[PDB]
Amino acid sequence: GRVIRGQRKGAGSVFRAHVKHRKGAARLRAVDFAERHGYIKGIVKDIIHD
Amino acid sequence: GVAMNPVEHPFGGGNHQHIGKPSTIRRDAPAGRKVGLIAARRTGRLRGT
Amino acid sequence: VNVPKTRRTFCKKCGKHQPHKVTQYKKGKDSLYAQGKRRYDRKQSGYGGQTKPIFRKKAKTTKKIVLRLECVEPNCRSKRMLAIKRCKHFELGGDKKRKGQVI
RNA sequence: CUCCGGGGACAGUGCCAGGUGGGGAGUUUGACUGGGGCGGUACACCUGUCAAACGGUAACGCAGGUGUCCUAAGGCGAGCUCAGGGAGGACAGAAACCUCCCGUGGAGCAGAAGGGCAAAAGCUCGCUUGAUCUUGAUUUUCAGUACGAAUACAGACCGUGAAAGCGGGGCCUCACGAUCCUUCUGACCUUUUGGGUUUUAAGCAGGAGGUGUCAGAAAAGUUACCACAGGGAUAACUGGCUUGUGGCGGCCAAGCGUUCAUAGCGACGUCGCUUUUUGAUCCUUCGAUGUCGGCUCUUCCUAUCAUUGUGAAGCAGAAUUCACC
RNA sequence: ACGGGCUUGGCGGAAUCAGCGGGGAAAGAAGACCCUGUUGAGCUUGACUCUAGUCUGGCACGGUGAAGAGACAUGAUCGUU
RNA sequence: CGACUGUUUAAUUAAAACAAAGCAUCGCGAAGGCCCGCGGCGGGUGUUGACGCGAUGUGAUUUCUGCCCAGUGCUCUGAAUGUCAAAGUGAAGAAAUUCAAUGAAGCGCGGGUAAACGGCGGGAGUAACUAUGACUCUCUUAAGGUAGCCAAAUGCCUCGUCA
RNA sequence: CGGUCCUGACGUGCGAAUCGGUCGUCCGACCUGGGUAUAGGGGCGAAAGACUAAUCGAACCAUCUAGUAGCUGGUUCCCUC
RNA sequence: AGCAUG
RNA sequence: GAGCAGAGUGGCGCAGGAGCGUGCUGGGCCCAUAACCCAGAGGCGAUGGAUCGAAACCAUCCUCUGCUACCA
Numbered sequence: 020g021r022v023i024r025g026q027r028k029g030a031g032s033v034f035r036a037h038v039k040h041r042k043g044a045a046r047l048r049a050v051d052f053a054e055r056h057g058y059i060k061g062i063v064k065d066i067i068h069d
Numbered sequence: 070g071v072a073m074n075p076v077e078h079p080f081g082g083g084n085h086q087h088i089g090k091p092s093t094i095r096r097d098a099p100a101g102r103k104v105g106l107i108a109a110r111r112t113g114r115l116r117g118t
Numbered sequence: 119v120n121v122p123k124t125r126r127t128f129c130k131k132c133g134k135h136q137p138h139k140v141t142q143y144k145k146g147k148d149s150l151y152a153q154g155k156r157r158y159d160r161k162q163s164g165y166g167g168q169t170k171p172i173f174r175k176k177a178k179t180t181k182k183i184v185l186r187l188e189c190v191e192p193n194c195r196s197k198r199m200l201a202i203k204r205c206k207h208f209e210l211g212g213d214k215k216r217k218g219q220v221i
Numbered sequence: 222c223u224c225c226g227g228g229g230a231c232a233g234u235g236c237c238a239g240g241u242g243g244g245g246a247g248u249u250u251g252a253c254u255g256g257g258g259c260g261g262u263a264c265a266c267c268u269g270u271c272a273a274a275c276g277g278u279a280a281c282g283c284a285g286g287u288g289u290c291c292u293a294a295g296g297c298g299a300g301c302u303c304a305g306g307g308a309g310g311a312c313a314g315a316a317a318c319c320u321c322c323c324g325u326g327g328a329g330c331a332g333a334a335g336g337g338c339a340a341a342a343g344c345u346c347g348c349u350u351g352a353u354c355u356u357g358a359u360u361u362u363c364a365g366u367a368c369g370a371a372u373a374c375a376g377a378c379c380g381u382g383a384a385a386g387c388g389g390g391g392c393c394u395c396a397c398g399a400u401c402c403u404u405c406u407g408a409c410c411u412u413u414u415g416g417g418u419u420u421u422a423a424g425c426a427g428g429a430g431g432u433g434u435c436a437g438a439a440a441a442g443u444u445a446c447c448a449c450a451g452g453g454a455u456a457a458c459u460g461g462c463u464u465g466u467g468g469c470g471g472c473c474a475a476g477c478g479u480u481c482a483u484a485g486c487g488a489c490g491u492c493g494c495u496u497u498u499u500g501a502u503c504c505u506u507c508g509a510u511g512u513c514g515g516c517u518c519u520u521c522c523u524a525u526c527a528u529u530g531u532g533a534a535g536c537a538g539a540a541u542u543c544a545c546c
Numbered sequence: 547a548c549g550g551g552c553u554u555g556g557c558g559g560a561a562u563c564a565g566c567g568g569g570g571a572a573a574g575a576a577g578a579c580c581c582u583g584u585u586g587a588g589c590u591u592g593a594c595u596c597u598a599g600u601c602u603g604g605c606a607c608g609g610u611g612a613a614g615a616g617a618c619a620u621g622a623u624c625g626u627u
Numbered sequence: 628c629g630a631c632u633g634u635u636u637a638a639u640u641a642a643a644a645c646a647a648a649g650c651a652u653c654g655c656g657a658a659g660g661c662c663c664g665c666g667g668c669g670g671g672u673g674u675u676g677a678c679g680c681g682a683u684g685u686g687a688u689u690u691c692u693g694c695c696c697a698g699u700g701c702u703c704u705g706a707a708u709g710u711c712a713a714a715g716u717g718a719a720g721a722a723a724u725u726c727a728a729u730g731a732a733g734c735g736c737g738g739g740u741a742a743a744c745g746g747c748g749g750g751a752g753u754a755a756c757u758a759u760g761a762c763u764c765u766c767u768u769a770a771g772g773u774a775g776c777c778a779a780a781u782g783c784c785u786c787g788u789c790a
Numbered sequence: 791c792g793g794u795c796c797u798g799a800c801g802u803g804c805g806a807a808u809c810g811g812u813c814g815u816c817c818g819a820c821c822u823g824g825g826u827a828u829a830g831g832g833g834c835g836a837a838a839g840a841c842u843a844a845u846c847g848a849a850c851c852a853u854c855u856a857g858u859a860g861c862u863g864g865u866u867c868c869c870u871c
Numbered sequence: 872a873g874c875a876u877g
Numbered sequence: 878g879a880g881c882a883g884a885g886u887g888g889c890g891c892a893g894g895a896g897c898g899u900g901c902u903g904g905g906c907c908c909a910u911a912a913c914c915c916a917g918a919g920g921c922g923a924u925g926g927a928u929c930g931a932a933a934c935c936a937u938c939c940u941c942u943g944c945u946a947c948c949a
């Protein structure tokens with residue numbers, strides 16, 4: 020037979036995600052001394068839709 | 070899959086659109102065969118929790 | 119058929135007729151170091167699948183019965199193989215069939 | 222003295238081993254055949270016939286059988302005679318057992334059929350294992366190859382009978398299987414390799430495990446998406462032979478026809494014609510003869526519906542039937 | 547086994563024009579239907595033989611200690627596993 | 628017949644076929660699920676995290692989704708007799724070798740599951756005119772076709788019977 | 791942008807798929823240029839076994855290869871027995 | 872525990 | 878047409894040394910009928926053959942039931 024489409028999806032030729040207009044990867048703050056022991060404050064500036 | 074051809078899918082083919090074999094495939098099935106309900110513990114409409 | 123357990127017949131080592139012990143012959147266990155066995159084993163080892171034919175189409179439902187005759191003489195102990203015609207049922211030392219009896 | 226945390230001798234990797242594995246690979250998917258397929262086995266064997274009075278001789282010809290069974294249903298010897306029928310005897314009878322008479326087989330001999338058999342080849346007793354070891358020759362199918370089966374001897378060792386003899390399977394015609402591989406049996410057997418001892422292994426001879434497609438490859442389908450080499454050796458359409466079948470027509474005359482076989486019909490039988498029905502065949506056509514209907518258009522046939530000319534009616538007229546050119 | 551040619555007859559007269567669709571079993575394409583071949587390919591599965599992958603066991607990488615059940619060097623310490 | 632819009636065999640088929648929203652299952656909490664790769668601390672989903680990704684069936688709305696776990700699949704627990712490779716352990720033997728015990732997954736054994744693949748009977752008597760026959764007897768299955776619908780694009784008989 | 795019907799024209803054509811009238815859609819799952827990614831047992835597919843340079847139920851190019859064919863076709867002067 | 876009918 | 882299944886008490890069925898539930902009949906309990914209880918009677922499709930013996934085995938038939946009768 021022939022390779023099925025669910026099986027073709029692994030190579031990611033035309034099945035890769037469309038990521039040009041994404042605004043970035045949403046991640047928490049990195050671990051450091053300040054947040055490990057005390058705390059720091061940050062200002063919220065924008066709320067975006069990606 | 071049933072709308073496809075047998076060369077294209079393990080379900081395609083026949084004079085009627087029917088799967089022709091149990092839809093529950095085992096977990097250890099090779100890629101290209103592992104379609105349908107993947108290692109289903111149960112099937113059908115849920116009745117309760 | 120029915121065959122008695124004792125028979126008087128020719129003995130090759132003694133050179134004359136002697137009583138014998140009659141038992142049915144049974145095939146021995148296949149050796150692992152026969153020439154054919156180890157040639158076949160080496161041929162099968164590796165890749166390539168089955169290398170010799172395998173018989174599939176049985177036709178016969180009977181096998182020829184072979185008797186093992188042992189000379190009862192203490193210091194001879196000679197043995198022979200005596201083949202009889204193929205039969206479905208075979209027994210050694212069955213009760214003799216008698217006529218003029220009520221069934 | 223490991224950058225911080227989190228796991229940790231476990232994930233994991235490398236090599237073997239066991240499962241699973243049409244995801245994928247390779248391949249196979251018998252023959253004969255009144256086309257092929259379904260069916261069947263006429264594929265290996267035996268009996269009667271076909272078969273045309275030596276032998277041989279075909280079809281998916283006719284009627285049947287086989288892949289077994291037997292410690293005796295094998296081998297001797299002895300003694301008896303069977304199927305059936307008749308006449309008698311308490312229960313007892315249509316049929317139980319006893320007695321006499323007739324009884325050429327009309328019974329039986331394991332099985333299908335044919336042949337053969339009466340102080341036996343059958344039935345009953347007694348003893349037994351020639352259904353054992355061995356080299357050759359011949360017959361049957363036949364290529365005068367093999368297997369299978371059989372025949373006549375010869376050499377041992379035996380059984381049986383007083384003995385002559387008989388007997389190395391079944392009264393005869395059937396009842397079965399090569400190479401390679403495995404297994405058992407035999408020898409004060411041969412080799413196991415530079416010598417020797419010992420296990421092992423390989424040789425020689427005889428049995429067994431099997432190929433039924435039976436002179437013996439290891440083998441499931443589908444293709445209406447299909448391909449190639451070919452076949453008129455072989456189907457579907459047309460043409461040809463035939464005419465069961467379909468259609469049409471005769472001869473005979475029991476009866477119908479209120480009387481009256483034949484105005485008109487006409488049973489039981491029997492004789493033909495046509496190829497506008499369907500069958501059977503496979504001669505032409507597979508390097509292609511464009512398949513069913515309808516439309517259009519020409520011609521031909523008569524087995525005459527109407528029309529012209531007639532003959533007969535159970536033809537008064539009208540109408541309707543039968544027949545003729 | 548439906549001849550243009552052969553046999554027996556009917557018969558036959560140069561060279562041409564416009565149409566026509568009866569026939570040349572007209573042309574095209576070594577029939578695509580059917581059968582044969584010990585020729586194939588696409589596809590399938592309860593065909594035969596394998597196989598990627600996957601599940602599991604052993605060995606090596608592969609160490610440091612403490613307790614439990616043990617074989618051990620008739621109760622017990624000590625050390626081999 | 629298909630909800631609609633849309634799509635399709637470029638060159639014989641534009642369709643009732645495909646898709647579609649809606650509906651319903653299945654797997655997976657990242658050392659993961661599905662998949663690619665000859666190969667590596669390789670790669671896609673994934674600049675992702677269950678209101679997600681991946682695998683399927685059906686096919687808008689309304690009204691419903693009947694019974695069957697016997698068959699084949701799928702899946703859940705390993706201690707009763709089971710079976711079961713390699714390695715390792717013990718014993719006999721001059722050794723090759725042989726024997727014995729132990730013994731993983733899988734298969735058996737035991738549950739669950741049909742919006743998994745699929746399946747869903749026959750024969751007789753019987754009401755006070757005939758006729759039907761609610762009713763009864765029986766054999767039988769895993770269950771014996773429920774609600775609906777029909778000579779239908781599904782019915783041989785068949786140009787079924789009535790209008 | 792597409793391609794229903796006339797099964798019209800043409801069918802050694804204008805054209806190895808064109809022409810006419812009639813047709814479907816025409817704010818969206820819309821039409822389109824250039825750039826870019828996916829390669830042959832592979833891609834890609836709103837799925838027709840469709841498309842992948844006039845080639846697709848496995849493209850094209852060279853080679854193994856003068857592959858095999860129990861099957862079609864052909865096979866070259868004379869006379870004499 | 873089973874208990875229909877006129 | 879070929880293969881194949883099945884004929885058994887009144888009706889539906891089991892099956893080498895004639896029966897089941899139901900039906901039917903007699904008697905019980907009841908005012909009476911059914912239900913309930915106690916008893917009883919009722920017969921291998923046909924033919925031929927293998928067999929000491931068959932309803933069961935083997936052939937031919939008489940019915941009936943189902944499955945195929947494709948490809949052009």
Ligand SMILES: COC(=O)C[C@@](O)(CCC(C)(C)O)C(=O)O[C@@H]1C(OC)=C[C@]23CCCN2CCc2cc4c(cc2[C@H]13)OCO4
Pocket residue numbers: 457458459506509510511512579
């Ligand atoms: C271009 O189309 C063609 O070529 C036609 C064709 O395909 C069509 C028929 C078929 C598809 C079945 O083959 C074909 O094969 O015809 C064959 C032919 O060639 C013309 C000659 C034959 C033989 C002698 C007369 N007859 C003429 C028609 C014919 C009709 C048939 C038939 C066989 C034939 C053959 O069987 C059922 O009816």
Ligand SMILES: [Mg+2]
Pocket residue numbers: 072073074
């Ligand atoms: Mg399709």
Ligand SMILES: [Mg+2]
Pocket residue numbers: 020075078079
């Ligand atoms: Mg497949």
Ligand SMILES: [Mg+2]
Pocket residue numbers: 163164
């Ligand atoms: Mg190996």
Ligand SMILES: [Mg+2]
Pocket residue numbers: none
């Ligand atoms: Mg394959």
Ligand SMILES: [Mg+2]
Pocket residue numbers: none
């Ligand atoms: Mg092939």
Ligand SMILES: [Mg+2]
Pocket residue numbers: none
């Ligand atoms: Mg053939």
Ligand SMILES: [Mg+2]
Pocket residue numbers: none
């Ligand atoms: Mg003669």
Ligand SMILES: [Mg+2]
Pocket residue numbers: none
């Ligand atoms: Mg005598």
Ligand SMILES: [Mg+2]
Pocket residue numbers: none
């Ligand atoms: Mg002699």
Ligand SMILES: [Mg+2]
Pocket residue numbers: none
């Ligand atoms: Mg005799």
Ligand SMILES: [Mg+2]
Pocket residue numbers: 400401
């Ligand atoms: Mg050989």
Ligand SMILES: [Mg+2]
Pocket residue numbers: none
């Ligand atoms: Mg040596």
Ligand SMILES: [Mg+2]
Pocket residue numbers: none
């Ligand atoms: Mg030495």
Ligand SMILES: [Mg+2]
Pocket residue numbers: 445
């Ligand atoms: Mg088709």
Ligand SMILES: [Mg+2]
Pocket residue numbers: 453503
């Ligand atoms: Mg011919």
